[PDB]
């Protein structure tokens, strides 16, 4: 067995979501990474239901040296792929982005 905490996890959770909002609307790039296989289809659901162009997702294994960027991959496999943003390909295949 191990620890629990209700107030801290809610506070940290709302805190991290506000952190995601500021880094997103300051024009950065957000990557969501979880390499546990059981929760991968939920991440596919999120990767199909997302709307903003800057949230990115990864579900497979973590390759050795992903963020090393030693050889110029222009960013590694978690970065800019159709796997990273599956929604961007389909949203542009439909052609209509939520655009004004």
Query: From residue 42 to residue 71, what is the string marking binding to RNA with x (rule CB under 7 A)?
Result: -----------------------------x
DSSP, res 58: E
Asked if 84 and 58 count as a contact pair (C-beta separation under 8 A), the reply is yes
Nearer to RNA, 20 or 75 (CB): 75
Instruction: Rule CB under 7 A: say whether 81 interacts with RNA.
Output: yes
Alpha helices in the chain (DSSP H): 6-25, 40-49, 86-94
Residues in the chain after which the backbone breaks (C–N beyond 2.5 Å):
none
Instruction: Rule CB under 7 A: say whether 2 interacts with RNA.
Output: no
Q: Which residues, listed in sequence order, are joined to residue 57 by a DSSP beta bridge?
A: 32
Instruction: Rule CB under 7 A: say whether 72 interacts with RNA.
Output: yes
Among 2, 6, 51, 74, which residue interacts with RNA (rule: CB under 7 A)?
74
Residues binding RNA (CB under 7 A): 71-77, 79-83, 88-89, 92
């Amino acid at each position: 067995a191990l620890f629990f905490d209700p107030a801290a996890t809610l506070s940290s959770t709302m805190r991290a979501l506000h952190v995601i909002r500021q880094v997103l609307e300051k024009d950065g790039h957000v990557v969501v990474v979880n390499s546990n296989p059981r929760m991968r289809p939920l991440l596919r659901e999120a990767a199909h239901l997302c709307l903003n162009s800057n949230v990115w997702f990864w579900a497979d294994d973590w390759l050795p040296g992903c963020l090393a960027e030693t050889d110029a991959r222009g960013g590694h496999c978690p970065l800019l792929s159709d796997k990273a943003q599956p929604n961007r390909q389909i949203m542009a295949e439909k052609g209509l982005v939520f655009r004004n």
